[PDB]
Symmetry: D2
Subunit: 102 residues, 4 copies
């Protein structure tokens, strides 16, 4: 009927956080997060924070910061300037998730 959709990541922040405000005006910050698994492959994650965690992320995270993150997966549908249909899967960290500077 309904399910579980949970993501946990520990890794290093790719560049400085980009935080912006909606009209509301609630904070949304964006980062990319690198995790690596060795047998080396590194994996880049698009993490987006909302609400209090957005402000905290925006304030405290920097390029190279190590951080723990817990959220859920959302794939957004969007259009390129040729029309078409593109998709991006992100890790949404909001009130139902968590973040910890490490």
């Amino acid at each position: 009927a309904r399910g579980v959709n949970k993501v946990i990541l520990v890794g290093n922040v790719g560049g400085d956080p980009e935080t912006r405000y909606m009209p509301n005006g609630n904070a949304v910050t964006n980062i990319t997060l690198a995790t690596s698994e060795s047998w080396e492959r590194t994996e880049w994650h698009r993490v987006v924070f909302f609400g209090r965690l957005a402000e905290i992320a925006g304030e405290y995270l920097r390029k190279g910061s190590q951080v723990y993150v817990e959220g859920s997966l959302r794939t957004r549908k969007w259009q390129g300037q040729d029309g078409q249909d593109r998709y991006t899967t992100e890790i949404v960290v909001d009130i139902n998730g968590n973040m910890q500077l490490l």
Copy 2:
């Protein structure tokens, strides 16, 4: 050198597609639906490797409820038009887990 973990419980979207590579090894593919009701449903591309692939292929059907634990991998590809596209999947292999529910 990071943590990259995904846990999902949801219902399988269509019958599993399983195929064999050279080497004699199974890879099965499903889509998995998770929903949070106040309703939004989220579709996940899950791909299994190794023993779990055979087990998935054999036991999962359209509508099956299943628990899944894997890690996120986004694959880059050029679409027929010149463009870069990305597909993020949940890889469930020896480091992950699956459990048929019901």
Copy 3:
């Protein structure tokens, strides 16, 4: 830090739910998880729910129900009737956690 527990298993007996003056509900179960490989070892967990999930658990869980549970670990200290220190570690599932009835 982070303190997180995820369990899928079968409920051991009927839930025991009770209400405080407030009221607010608290329900208790035991939950069995097994790893098979001996031929199986089963592990018994003391899970306790608070708030909305407590009512939902109380209502919907029964002996034998399969359920998913996400909470955090709390270990309670107590003196037993021999005067000795005892400890009980529970999985607390509250507003920060989650529960999902499985099957149909």
Copy 4:
């Protein structure tokens, strides 16, 4: 079923590592996680086996921050009987994971 625990916190004292009749290492720590609402800290008994036991023993120290993923095992034991006692531990072995944090 599924029996999974994930913790991030600070190690309570130096790790205690010991070796078994074979050669295999087992190391023990306590791990503190805290939530402020103004604060409650929770102490976890974590026990490592195999490679992670050696890595834990070598690299973890009092105050180290670490990520840990394991499963819950409650052990029965006598000790002094006295009486029989029970202790729930987080077992981190080949099916789990650990990551030293900080840099």
